[model samples]
Target: GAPVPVDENDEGLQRALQFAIAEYNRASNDKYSSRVVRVISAKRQLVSGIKYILQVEIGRTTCPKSSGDLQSCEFHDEPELAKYTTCTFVVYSIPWLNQIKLLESKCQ
Candidate 1:
């Protein structure tokens, strides 16, 4: 079967991704907000239903415009383009169990 198509443009996927980030920020002791300004992709593992490999463009502040306006937005995944914003991250979302585990995070 196909990978079921996931990308920065997938609103449904983005919603799940956004929820995961919001949940993470809330559970941690961080004083500031963390936002997902852009999502490169997130896909369920070929052999696993509960684990998703995700790559994303991250921002220290909330994304401004509506989700649909992302294509015209300034946030991006390219190292050169992303360095101007804030950072990027990789994570695993086990949506069925409602868990998002941070795999790695760093600024570009």
Candidate 2:
């Protein structure tokens, strides 16, 4: 079956988005961490478990990636300091096993 479009607000999708964002931040070399600014699209496919496909806008924040938590980080207010990118992320999840993995990520 083809991938089915899902609501951006879906609970499972939201969870997957968080996982993808965290993975992105972990893999990023930028000093400042990034956060999801907006979710452009989401799709779900069933293959053994659930695969989430997402397109989102992520913005760099003032807090350093070294910071333990991004909850307190704020997006750069200065236009020059502000950085945003659109990214596509693919995540595989097995809710019953409480497992999640980011399969691919690309930003531009």
Candidate 3:
């Protein structure tokens, strides 16, 4: 069953995922196709200076380099990450899962 209301075509789910990528892609047009990694817990850095998004999900780096069957290669505890979330991503990629790299998720 689909996570959202949709038909067998999965139009709704597809739309949602597309929106996620597009949101980052729009910002990644300059150099790389990526989005800014959201900072959680502490004050989120603006990251406004960067021309492109300064973050990459585990497997979902790009279409050609997607995180196959795995949302991310990193693993993280949501609660623990809620404080110093640097590479804490909430992307909706294939086989969606939450895994944060130790360095990325650690307090910076």
Candidate 4:
């Protein structure tokens, strides 16, 4: 099967990306905001047999933007240990891979 065909300037993608950014903004907006976060790219171990794009970030999540956007993650009730009122945020990333993902907790 051929690729689903994605447009670099896709409106839907733009909307989704925007939503993710908004989520990041909101998360970062809080007093417990992380110093920095990003929505970079990652390779899914399995996605339709091939590696599909995933939204990832370096540094700590404050909660990892896991679930890149608010919808995916419960933003209203932020993690308590997210820096003791210093939550992290998805501050930057490549625009192309704006899709959200679930960043597993590394809050050991």
**Candidates sorted by lDDT, best first:** 2, 1, 4, 3
lDDT of 4 by residue, 6-42 (tens): 3565454344444444454555544423332344442
Cα lDDT of all candidates, in order?
Answer: 0.49, 0.76, 0.31, 0.37
Which of the two candidates, 1 or 3, achieves a greater TM-score against the reference? 1
RMSD to native for every prediction?
Answer: 8.0, 3.3, 15.4, 12.0
What lDDT score is found at residue 69 in candidate 2? Answer: 69
- Which sequence of candidate numbers ranks them by TM-score, best first? 2, 1, 4, 3
Write down the TM-score for model 1: 0.41
Model 2 TM-score is 0.72
| RMSD versus native structure for model 4 | 12.0
Give the TM-score comparing model 3 with the true structure, all chains together. Answer: 0.28
lDDT of 3: 0.31
- Model 1 misplaced regions, further than 4 Å: 1-3, 7-15, 27-29, 48-50, 62-108
lDDT tens digits, residue span 1-108, model 3: 212223337443333334444554554334434433442222112222111112324122333224363444222324353222233322232323322111222111
Candidate 4 has its poorest 10 consecutive residues by lDDT at: 84-93
Predicted candidate 2 versus true structure: per-residue lDDT over 7-100, tens digit per residue? 6367878777887788767655377667788788788788788888898878777776547763576678765777689988888877679787
Of the candidates numbered 3 and 4, which has the greater lDDT value?
4
In model 4, which regions exceed 4 Å deviation? Answer: 1-5, 32-54, 58-108
